[PDB]
């Protein structure tokens, strides 16, 4: 269906020990495909995805310089904000910036994204229409005033509505077999007695792609939403993701339980029983 493109940028102060570190990571949906690190040996933008290794310096060299400009700005912002809030020079600070866009299956622009944060607190948000800034802090109000006056949102619009959309679109084609791929979970169920009377069932759904997954338990045909434990979706470390759930299952009552695993990437859900 639709697809998302995201970029995440972080700058962390490093008093004494050289200059603040700058980290940048790009994603298409769940897949990292580009990286950059100010402490990199190469000091240049690097690909991760096969299907973007065909890009020449006509992108990478300028993008590297752009990320350098981003780093320089973020470093200035960290110092500036310290001033704004009259904070100690001996203190540490972190600034976080992210942006990206959503597109439809036809590559149609859906939504733009841009948000900043400072020391764990929301700074400024830009609406999906990419027209209007929102300040979430004192310093944010100062910055917002500036950004509004210069229509900074317009710069984001040009990219997010255009370059981001076409960039992602092209990537979705070039990496079709790596991005739009599907991988069904290796479903299975195990029984884990707790006491003379108490036991649990574990519903496993490991090694699937993409990360999108829903687990459901039922008993006697009715959903079980109370006596249940679930884990958040986590990387498998092999390009796929893991997830499992469990419920309380008194010994001998296991026959009354059923687990279901639902995906959008699959034509049908999978059912587990014990």
């Amino acid at each position: 269906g639709s697809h998302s493109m995201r970029y995440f940028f972080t700058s962390v102060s490093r008093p004494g020990r050289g200059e603040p570190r700058f980290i940048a990571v790009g994603y298409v949906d769940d897949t990292q495909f580009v990286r950059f690190d100010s402490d990199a040996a190469s000091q240049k933008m690097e690909p991760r995805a096969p299907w973007i290794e065909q890009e020449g310096p006509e992108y990478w060299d300028q993008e590297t310089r752009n990320m350098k400009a981003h780093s320089q700005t973020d470093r200035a912002n960290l110092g500036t904000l310290r001033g704004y809030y009259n904070q100690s020079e001996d203190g540490s600070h972190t600034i976080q910036i992210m942006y990206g866009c959503d597109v439809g299956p036809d590559g149609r622009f859906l939504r733009g994204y841009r948000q900043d944060a400072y020391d764990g607190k929301d700074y400024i948000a830009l609406n999906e229409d990419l027209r209007s800034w929102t300040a979430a802090d004192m310093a944010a109000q100062i910055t917002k005033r500036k950004w509004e006056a210069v229509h900074a949102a317009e710069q984001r619009r040009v990219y997010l509505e255009g370059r981001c959309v076409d960039g992602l679109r092209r990537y979705l084609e070039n990496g079709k077999e790596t991005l739009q791929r599907t991988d069904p979970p290796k479903t299975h169920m195990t029984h884990h007695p707790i006491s003379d009377h108490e036991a649990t069932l574990r519903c496993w759904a490991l090694g699937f792609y993409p990360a999108e997954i829903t687990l459901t338990w039922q008993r006697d045909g009715e959903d079980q939403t109370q006596d249940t434990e679930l884990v958040e979706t986590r990387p498998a470390g092999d390009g796929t993701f893991q997830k499992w759930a469990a419920v309380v299952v008194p010994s001998g009552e296991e026959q009354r339980y059923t687990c279901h695993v639902q995906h959008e990437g699959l034509p049908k859900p999978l059912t587990l029983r014990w």
Partner: peptide
């Protein structure tokens, strides 16, 4: 494609 820094100042 990455974006280009513009008025990125606080």
């Amino acid at each position: 494609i990455l974006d280009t820094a513009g008025k990125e100042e606080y």
